[PDB]
Amino acid sequence: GKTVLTCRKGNGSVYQVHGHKRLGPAKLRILDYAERHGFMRGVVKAIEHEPGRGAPLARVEFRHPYKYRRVKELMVAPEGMFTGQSMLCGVKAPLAIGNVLPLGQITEGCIVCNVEAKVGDRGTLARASGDYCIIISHNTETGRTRLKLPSGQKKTVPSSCRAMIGIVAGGGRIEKPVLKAGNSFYRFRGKRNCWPKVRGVARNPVEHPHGGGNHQHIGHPSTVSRHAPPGQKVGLIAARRTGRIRGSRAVRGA
RNA sequence: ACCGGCGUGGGCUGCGCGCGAGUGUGCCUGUUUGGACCCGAAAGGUGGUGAACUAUGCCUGAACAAGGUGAAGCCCGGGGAAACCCCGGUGGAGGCCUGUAGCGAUGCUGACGUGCAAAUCGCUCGUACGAUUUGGGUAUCGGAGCGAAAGACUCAUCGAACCACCUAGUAGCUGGUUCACGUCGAAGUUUCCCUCAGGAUAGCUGGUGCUUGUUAAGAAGUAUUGUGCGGUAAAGCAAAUGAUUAGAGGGACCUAUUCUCAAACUUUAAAUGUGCAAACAACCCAGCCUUAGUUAUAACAAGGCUGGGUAAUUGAGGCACCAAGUGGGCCUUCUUCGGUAAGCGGAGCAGGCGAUGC
RNA sequence: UGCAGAUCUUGGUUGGCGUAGCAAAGAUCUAACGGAAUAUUUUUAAAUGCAACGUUGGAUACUGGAGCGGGGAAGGAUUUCGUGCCAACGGCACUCGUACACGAGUUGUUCGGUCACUGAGCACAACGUUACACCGUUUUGUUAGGAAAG
RNA sequence: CAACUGCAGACCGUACUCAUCACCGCAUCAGGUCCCCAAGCAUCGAAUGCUCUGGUACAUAGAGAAAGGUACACUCAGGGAAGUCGGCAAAAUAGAUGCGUAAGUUCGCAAGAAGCAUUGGCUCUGAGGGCAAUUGCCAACUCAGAACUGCUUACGGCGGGGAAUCCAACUGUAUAAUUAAAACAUAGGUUUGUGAUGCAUCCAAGUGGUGUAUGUCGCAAACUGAUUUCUGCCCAGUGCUCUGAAUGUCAACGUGACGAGAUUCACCGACGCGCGGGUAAACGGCGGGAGUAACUAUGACUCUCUUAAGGUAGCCAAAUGCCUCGUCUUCCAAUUAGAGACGCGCAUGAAUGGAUUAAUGAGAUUCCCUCUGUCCCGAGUUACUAUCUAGCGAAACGACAGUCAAGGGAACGGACUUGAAGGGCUAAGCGGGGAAAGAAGACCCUGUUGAGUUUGACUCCAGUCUGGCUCUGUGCGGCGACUUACGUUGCUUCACUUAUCGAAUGAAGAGACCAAUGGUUGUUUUGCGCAGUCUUCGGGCUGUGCGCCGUCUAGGCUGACGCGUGCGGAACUCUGCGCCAACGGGGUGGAAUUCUCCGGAGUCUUGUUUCGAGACAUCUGCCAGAUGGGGAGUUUGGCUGGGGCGGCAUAUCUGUUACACGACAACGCAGGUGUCCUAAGGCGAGCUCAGUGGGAUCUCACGUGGAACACAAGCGUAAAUGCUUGCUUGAUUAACGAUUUCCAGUACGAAUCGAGACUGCGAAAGCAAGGCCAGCGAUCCUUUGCGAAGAACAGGAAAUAUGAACAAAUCAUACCAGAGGUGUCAGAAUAAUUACCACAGGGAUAACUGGCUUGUGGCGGCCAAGCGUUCAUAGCGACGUCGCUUUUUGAUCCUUCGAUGUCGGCUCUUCCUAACCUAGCGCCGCAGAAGACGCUAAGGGUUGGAUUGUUCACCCACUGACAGGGAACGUGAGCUGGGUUUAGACCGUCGUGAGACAGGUUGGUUUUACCCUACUUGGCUGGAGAUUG
RNA sequence: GUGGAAAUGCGCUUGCCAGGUGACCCAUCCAUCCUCCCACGGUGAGCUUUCUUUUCACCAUAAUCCACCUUGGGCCUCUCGACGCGUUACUCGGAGCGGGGGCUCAAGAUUGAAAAAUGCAGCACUGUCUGUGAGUUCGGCGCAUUAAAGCAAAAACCUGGGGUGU
């Protein structure tokens, strides 16, 4: 047979992201001496839209700690951020929306976004529209903080990791029904080459494990093993259960 | 060399010996390998060249007559206690409608069908502000790429492109195979084979002979005489086994009969057949020899030595070596099995055609 | 080392046969001139030199501005111009020609490009891998365990 | 620095074209090819028609009413779909204005729904504005109205409409060159994996690559397919999964034993499997049989079998129903069609989605109005051809040729036999034959040929998971295990950091100074005691004490200094200021401020850029196990009245076929065989069986086998070859003895006659090395038995041989005799599918024509029991028997596989008779009328429609009548293309799957005549020895 | 350096830093240049059997520069508003509407230099024009509308903050 489409995407030839009109990665400030001992003050100058992303971004302007020049940064904006607002980043910063603080200085039960998983990662968790994390507890003996992730899982991080205060802007996006195939065309024009989608039963046996037959059907169970080789791993991968969920659903993930 | 059993025993085995026949070379024929008498696959492998056709993404440019309908927002009048509800304008939305250019290709199953054309032409037809059309640049390819998915397309080449090479690939299968005369001249049958369109093996044929003979040596698809073998035709059921009709004499039963039968019944039993013999490497008689065989021993067995006497009519007997083609058959007489039958299928004996005219 | 056939190979010849045809895009006529292409007869004038070509004037007509108009890119590369010429070629014709022959023609401080920008992207150096560089990385501010500023 | 002035301004391109002749299509080819400029009138106008400027008369022409054609050309009386598979094609509607507009609906639409009226020309009137001082002057065509007058309904351009059923929600895409669709996509719905040392995944490989410039409102992987209303039961099977490893089983690595060692054994040993849970919007599945209610009929009710569960809500002869043209209503004169109903439904049914749906559709189907040359039934006209001429000028094909009838023949002759025609050359047509041309048949079969695809085929490879070793270091504790309680050791707990791994940063400020279960051999000279124990006599090691390394500090408390806290700290308070290349101060030296250092700006480094994890990872390498159509390679018997399914005629035994020696075939007939038996083998003795009759199991007589002998059958046997009984192991060994059957005079199996040893039973002669003939197996490999102990001064008639430099003990190997098996039985290791298909061939072999046959089909004779009011025969005629035909279907396999175009209809000619009508006769159960039967007769005739692709059939009508057949099942270079029978797609059933179905459904290129003959017309010209004598 | 109360006007050099131009292409409406009609006039040809103060053609001004009334937008000042201003159109105003007077940007208009010395038509010389209406993407409304669709980048150039110089 021929190579399956799932394996062809790993070459990434015509399936890479469309990033010509993007603005760059959206990161926090670099963790330096000033943010570990005091605070830095910056001004929000612009709030802008990036194709392919649902959350608006903010351009913040700081002063260089050591040189006579100005530094411009690009971050994911929390809700309520406005142009002209003052941003404070550091250990000695107060607790307000849009400020960046170490996780150990934020009171339990507070809503945060742009959380660092490692000290210096510059933000990796809760970055999509309307998403946030919750601070559960602190442990001063070991210096670890426990959070609740948007997916429902719980994760422990060092207390020196930084986070923003508030929720990510642009929430409520998926509540509006797309109505036309034309609207889905423009949604994926900024992301990548992945739409429209052809069903596997509608292909031929040379292309997909589900192809062929005088009727359109799968002749074998769709649940496949975790050990299946590439080209065989299609369907529902390593599923613990199938069918309609009745009652409370367990937390997804490992 | 391998043994058995208690001496000048015994019985198996060798591509053994038994007064050598080999060896070198020339030439022809057969067996085998190689391109292998000549030409022919669908395939398989290695290394390269293509996205000018066409598929999809991206960068930067260009284009889309004339009409219909009339969404939000806005203005002014009315009604109402409130909540709010009505008329008229304005405005110009939509993967909206009619319709050019553009982009396509439904029907005539029209024209042409050695064409204008290796897919074109004429009317008619779909859509025509959008998931729209298009130039240049750029990015992803052959056990691969790409695909709103048709096994679509990747330079007239795709259920796996093109170029060169391995490669004169293999073919139990199809086609071909070039002078004359002369001497002979078949087979389609047996056994074994993943064998059934092919082989090996025996038979039929040719060549080369060897040993001999001149009336017959170990002669004969034929008779005679003598002496063996047989259960088919016929016959039988008043005889065994099986089937079966009806009366008679003592409803069954018994006795003697009676009609009608048999590839897998038989007392009897042909014709046509089929073994053997009818002499010289033999027989008959006489006198002897030997033995570890037989017999209680004259007598038998077996191998020898020395002298006497001995069924027509046709005619060459015996023995090797090497090799070819063939291994689809068909018809008729008589005897036959299956089938309603067949210019049907399957056998026995003989003669034919094939191979042959007159 | 001998050929009659292998849908055999390469040349040549052949009936069919002066046959099938040369039918989309409407179309030409007239006088004078040119030309070897005439007004060609010795055996009144018509019934014995037909048919066809170019230029100019006149007539008639088509394209009908999404044009058989006037300029460019890709591609072509002397097809451009003048003079001459009619063997072969323009599936009829030619005195015509993008044909043949001989000579000519393309002029920039300002026009287009380079000088002198970045884009989708490419891949020298350096490093790593590979039996073998003819391999990989090389724009998310950006090469290289990295001393790359003259 | 702004003016002016002087001088100098490099390189390459530049002609022409951009297309009905300059480019790509073999060409000056009706195909294709990007950009700019774009006039007047009609008109809504870049529609369409005509014209000024610019550009062109270039595409072979002349003459000219044959047939038949093509057309971007028309018209037809009366009827109006009667045509056809089907209204295909044509006709038809049409602009604008005023009025008017239904069911249904997601309230947007449907809608231009449907339908009605007006429209020319001419002469007038009104309304709709601007600027200057009520006046004056001036511009744009739109709309409304009136009088008069006219029509031959009169350019171009420009929707036909309505009522329903099926499918898909819609716009869109899509097999370039036969399929545009119901297929794909879509919005909506559901499920799965996953928190980055992640999930999916590329590469031969690395500090390599993609989703990821990302972060659960994300990314990756599936299924269904708008909205509305719903989505039932089943976890037994297969799959997936579990935070159950609890126990059984297992590989390397490890740990111990016997042995001299190779070897051998024991223990330990992970995931997985097993066991036990979960899961169907995972693959999938979702029952039978009796009885029963006041006429019958049905059965709410009962009983009984049985599943993992027994089809729920819905829907239906539906694109799914075989029977089937189901049954009822409606639509027509008539309906295998359509709609509405009914439902034990071969074989409907719920995200393998069920039901319903407005709007939309070059989708499939039925009816109605309008309209028509589709038809009754054809006729006339135009332009270009064909036809004749001038110029120019091919191809395909071509054994040789070209009149028929019958015969036989390879079973359909141009050539052959017999007969009958035949005059030379010829122009325009035509499509009967040349089984005409085009292509080494694509259907079917065969070959020890392939390829694409699948999986529970055979043999394997990546990937994933798991164990061991290595990478790999330092300490503190526990549980064991082994050696006399101290030494090694395997598991582990905890604390570390330097190997290693992850991340960030332009390696941009780590830690301490706050002081120890720190070090103190130190950049330029810092060590000092005590105790114990060693010494090479110089001084060390261990444990303890004191010094030194070694030290500053914003702020906040306490009484300008000390002492606790603090740990590098001076920052204005929901919305946008500047901030840089040092001021000052201390010294050194030179002067009246110039150079240097030190602070401003805290010191130090047993040293790591900083964080996280950390001796583990799954970090590197090497071994080991499991899983693994993701991938690679290969295979997937034979015979056969084609092949397949079936069967075994594939190795074998009896009777018969079989024709009186022997041999003899069929998917011929009737039956067997792969076993069974320490006795059912061997021998001696005694006895007589099956059955019958007479007497109360017992007794007597008869009894040729009519019983028995393991089994199939045949043969054989009576003081026995049978039965009972006693003793036994001849079912052992048997020096390579010979032979028969099959047969090649090979093997294997079976069997016969013997020689030797030791025996059994018999008083002996004698019988017995299985049970009589069917009951079984090569090479290579594996495995067992025999070559016991001694004797020999030497390998001998007597001691098995070898391991090749020689010796001791193991081990391996040879020679002889058996066993483990090949049933395809003279003996490869083996699953499917192809309609996407390929190649070499086969008329050795099927599907269509033809040929033989005639069971079956059809059509008739002979006899006469009966029926016919009595009466065999007016008319019929059973039980029997004799034929004919080739118009049915079978049987066969002769011709054709380098191809003979395969159903039906349309058109047209001809032949037959077994006679429906028309002609002439006879007879009747023939009064008249109307009919039955029979004979001679084939001259003439035999219809229009509804449903269906049909042939056939069945209805409605007319008629004198609406007969049956043949001609290659007449007729495709005559047509048409509805059916059948490729590739697309949907349903039902079947299959794990790819796929299958002579089940249903929808869409799907019909090529060439100019040659010979035949036929139809059209002309020229010879010929009497049918050219000569 | 300097003028004005203000909007802002007129006449030495940049190690470093910060802005701007480049730079983002619109239905509708208005609109330059341009071409197309009309009205008046000049010049030259055409028809004339009969009519036609008639039919046809032409009537042109390149770049560059000087001086300084219309339209649209931004702003200053005085008087300080609740109803008021304004578009075909979906607006706006004590965070400052409207009115008087001004500063400024963009697109046009007008006078002049160039330039009649040129060009055109007729025969050496003659003539050598303006005003209306319709169409048309330069420019303007930093424009409406879908948007889970919402600014390509850089060289080069311009100005300022500081500093230097006078």
Ligand SMILES: [K+]
């Ligand atoms: K939000």
Ligand SMILES: [K+]
């Ligand atoms: K042979």
Ligand SMILES: [K+]
């Ligand atoms: K309607």
Ligand SMILES: [K+]
């Ligand atoms: K279509």
Ligand SMILES: [K+]
């Ligand atoms: K979906």
Ligand SMILES: [K+]
């Ligand atoms: K289950």
Ligand SMILES: [K+]
């Ligand atoms: K299960």
Ligand SMILES: [K+]
């Ligand atoms: K359609």
Ligand SMILES: [K+]
């Ligand atoms: K013909």
Ligand SMILES: [K+]
């Ligand atoms: K014996």
Ligand SMILES: [K+]
């Ligand atoms: K073999």
Ligand SMILES: [Mg+2]
């Ligand atoms: Mg990228």
Ligand SMILES: [Mg+2]
């Ligand atoms: Mg498909």
Ligand SMILES: [Mg+2]
């Ligand atoms: Mg597969």
Ligand SMILES: [Mg+2]
């Ligand atoms: Mg389906």
Ligand SMILES: [Mg+2]
């Ligand atoms: Mg070859």
